[PDB]
Ligand SMILES: [Ca+2]
């Protein structure tokens with residue numbers, strides 16, 4: 672008896688959190704079927720209408736993975752990335768995979784926004800934290816990416832493109848070892864169109880794909896970062912399909928990654944992620960999530976997925 676009404680959604684959620692226990696299905700039936708933008712209007716309407724803070728109430732009413740997914744869904748796009756990078760770096764351990772996932776997949780523009788926001792939210796620069804929590808070549812790649820200075824044009828410099836391919840090839844022909852800085856320079860600095868052309872040229876002169884050379888010539892998180900960049904440049908949806916596969920295959924589940932990817936990409940390219948997932952693994956993302964998770968947690972996850980393939 673109306674279209675999208677933030678106030679009405681606010682009432683549904685409040686009712687769901689009232690009384691003994693919590694009607695999580697009511698919560699899902701609303702939030703999982705609203706856009707990130709709409710969820711922000713709901714937060715505003717809830718505080719206006721109820722005089723309480725929606726995020727605080729959700730946190731006090733929910734727990735575990737279900738809580739993590741719902742709160743993630745409720746967080747504005749930029750702030751979610753910022754809070755995920757911070758979480759990746761707090762504590763003794765560092766979630767380098769998360770750092771790579773975010774820094775290799777977001778545009779230089781989105782990264783610049785994440786930068787300023789990181790600074791305002793915590794008081795330190797994203798770069799400083801990266802420098803403190805990572806080292807050597809991997810640190811350098813992240814420092815470059817985090818600054819968001821990658822060429823944003825679509826300009827193709829023929830001469831430079833040919834030289835880049837050569838430098839990359841020669842980098843894997845050095846006696847002492849792989850001239851890793853070359854990979855960093857080319858893969859972190861050039862614009863997409865230029866890089867994609869460089870990959871073709873590389874293939875021509877080396878008779879091998881850049882990805883296979885990266886896998887045999889480099890290792891560790893540095894290797895992962897380069898691969899992430901290449902994959903995100905060529906077929907970003909496939910990169911996330913793989914990310915999701917790795918988080919669910921074999922004993923257990925990397926819930927942090929599973930949740931972040933499903934939440935962050937739900938409104939961006941989930942359909943294409945699903946297509947690539949089935950192509951790569953023969954199974955549908957839906958079937959994988961369904962058999963690797965459970966509870967209301969699984970329910971919201973399957974909905975973010977969108978349906979079986
Ligand atoms: Ca309750």
Ligand SMILES: [Ca+2]
Nearest residue numbers: 919920921923
């Ligand atoms: Ca598993």
